[PDB]
Amino acid sequence: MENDKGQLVELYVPRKCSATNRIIKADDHASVQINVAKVDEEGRAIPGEYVTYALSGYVRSRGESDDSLNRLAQNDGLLKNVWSYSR
Template identity: 75%
Template sequence: MENDKGELVDLYVPRKCSATNRIIKAKDHGSVQISIAKVDENGRVTGENQVYALCGFVRAMGEGDDSLNRLAQRDGLLKNFSGWVGRGLGWARKLNKAHLVEEKLAAFSTHMLR
């Protein structure tokens, strides 16, 4: 909620996951908040930082590192050092494995019905 001056006056503003945009609940004990310091061209800390919050759901799926790499690359903190970074292939691999399991089950059930 905002007052007439446009300032936030809520007592509690919940955090949101930077990767999924989900609200991080108070009981989400798997969530983390990571601050990455910004540096100048000489590698010295400028005093500014970029904050990322990751919910327990992303971390439980094993996608925390991929999500953090994708977010840091989007914000210019990480170079695109590989074609794999930032494409979300971890999620695609899991979906591909699920698809392969479905194909094997379908082939098995077809074989059993003969």
């Protein structure tokens, strides 16, 4: 957080699960970060610029990491129609 005169006094600011907004802890050794390479015209990976999602250890431990990543990628246009909001 920040003190009275601004000046954020906090060791670090933790990442968040892009699926469930949980805080990824320093001990969360099942949590992963997925980087997807953005693709230009005529199909090149553009080495250096990525679309990134963070999945906490809990989501992958519960098996919904694939479905959550399907939703986040579809929301960002990385996937077209594989994920469905209704079931």
